[PDB]
């Protein structure tokens, strides 16, 4: 389906987050994509502890 070419190097918009998902294993890069309220998808490095904590925060709601 879709793959990430670059990681968002900045702060993640926790309170604007709607959901998250994982890109396919067939992508060249591993990625966690965040989807915001207003529809923006943001590629994120799955090894970044900030990214992991964002996913943990979002899934725990």
């Amino acid at each position: 389906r879709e793959c990430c070419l670059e990681y968002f190097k900045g702060a993640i918009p926790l309170r604007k987050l709607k959901t998250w998902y994982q890109t396919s294993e067939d992508c060249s890069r591993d990625a966690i994509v965040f989807v915001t309220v207003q529809g923006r998808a943001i590629c994120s490095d799955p090894n970044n502890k900030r990214v992991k904590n964002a996913v943990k925060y979002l899934q725990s709601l």
Binding site: C3, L5, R40
Partner: protein
Amino acid sequence: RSACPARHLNNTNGTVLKLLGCHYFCNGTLSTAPDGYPCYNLTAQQVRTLTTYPNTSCAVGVCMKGTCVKNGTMEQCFKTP
């Protein structure tokens, strides 16, 4: 805005998904694939006749300074729907 997921082309031989060319849109702006990223170098006609069915032999390449540099390899590619 360049850290968004991008539409790629699918293949039949079980290998890594690859970009059409070396550029992609995010938020309405065009960004460049990173150097070394896997890509397809299609002719104009191939882009025009690309479908969601395998029907086309696509030249594989690596992105270098925004160009899809062919590595001599060919594989069937087609649009993810």
